[PDB]
C-alpha cells in the first residue's frame, strides 16, 4: 500500500526530526505551546464555526442518502412507506438544524480585539473554546447522522414488511438522534462560558 508506506514514512520523518532536535539540546525549540500562543485565536474560532456547520451538514446529508436510497429501494414494492418513513429524514436533518443553530450562536462571540487584546487570556480562551466546541458539534452530528441514516435504512427495509416493525424500530433511531442532541447540549455548554473577543 503506497499510501500506508507514505504514512509510515512521514511518521518516521517526524520522529527523526524530534530526535534530532532533542539530541542537539534544542528539544525545547519544538514548543507546541508557543505554536498555540502565537496563532491568532480568530483562526481557532473560525475553523471551529466552519467545521461545526460543515461537518454537521456532512453528517446530515450522509445519513439522508443512506436512508433515502433504501427508502426508494423498498418503495418500489411498498409505496405506502414514504410518508410514514419521512420521519427518518426529519431525524436525520435535525442534526443539520443543530449545526446551523450552533454556528449562528458562535457567530455572536466573533468580534474584533485591540492590538494588546488580540492574544489576551480571554481572547485565547474564546478562540480555543469556539474551535473545540465546533469540532465537538460537527463530529458528533456527523456520526449521529451516520447512525441515524443506517437506522433509517433498516427502518425502511422493515416497514417494507410491516408497519409495526417500523413503529418498534423507531426507538433505535430516536436514540441515534439523541446522540446528536447530546452533542448539541455539550457543545453549547462548553461554549457558553466563552466571552466574545472584546
Amino acid at each position: 500500500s503506497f499510501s500506508h508506506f507514505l504514512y509510515y514514512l512521514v511518521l518516521i520523518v517526524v520522529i527523526v526530526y524530534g530526535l534530532y532536535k532533542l539530541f542537539t539540546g534544542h528539544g525545547s525549540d519544538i514548543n507546541f505551546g508557543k505554536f498555540l500562543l502565537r496563532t491568532s485565536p480568530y483562526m481557532w474560532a473560525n475553523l471551529g464555526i466552519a467545521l461545526c456547520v460543515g461537518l454537521s451538514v456532512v453528517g446530515a446529508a450522509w445519513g439522508i442518502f443512506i436512508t433515502g436510497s433504501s427508502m426508494i429501494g423498498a418503495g418500489v414494492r411498498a409505496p405506502r412507506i414514504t410518508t410514514k418513513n419521512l420521519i427518518s429524514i426529519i431525524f436525520c436533518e435535525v442534526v443539520a438544524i443543530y449545526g446551523l443553530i450552533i454556528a449562528i450562536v458562535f457567530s455572536s462571540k466573533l468580534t474584533v480585539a485591540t492590538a494588546e487584546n488580540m492574544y489576551s487570556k480571554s481572547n485565547l480562551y474564546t478562540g480555543y473554546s469556539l474551535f473545540w466546541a465546533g469540532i465537538t458539534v460537527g463530529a458528533s452530528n456527523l456520526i449521529c447522522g451516520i447512525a441515524v441514516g443506517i437506522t433509517g435504512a433498516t427502518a425502511a427495509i422493515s416497514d417494507a414488511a410491516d408497519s409495526a416493525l417500523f413503529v418498534k424500530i423507531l426507538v433505535i433511531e430516536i436514540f441515534g438522534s439523541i446522540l446528536g442532541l447530546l452533542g448539541l447540549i455539550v457543545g453549547l455548554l462548553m461554549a457558553g462560558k466563552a466571552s466574545e473577543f472584546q
Partner: protein, 51 residues
C-alpha cells in the same frame, strides 16, 4: 518569543489550513472517482429472455 524563523506562526497556520483543505479535497475526489456507471441498464444485451 520568536518561533523557528523558517516555520513562522503565519506559515504554520497557512500549512495547517492547507492540510485541512487538501484532506477535504482528497476525500471528495476519493468519492467522486469511485463513481461507476450501471452499464447493464445501458448496453443492449442479446439475452432472449432479458428482452
Amino acid at each position: 518569543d520568536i518561533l523557528s524563523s523558517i516555520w513562522t506562526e503565519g506559515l504554520l497556520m497557512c500549512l495547517i489550513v492547507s492540510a485541512l483543505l487538501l484532506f477535504i479535497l482528497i476525500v471528495a475526489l476519493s468519492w467522486i472517482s469511485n463513481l461507476d456507471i450501471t452499464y447493464g441498464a445501458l448496453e443492449k444485451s442479446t439475452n432472449p429472455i432479458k428482452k
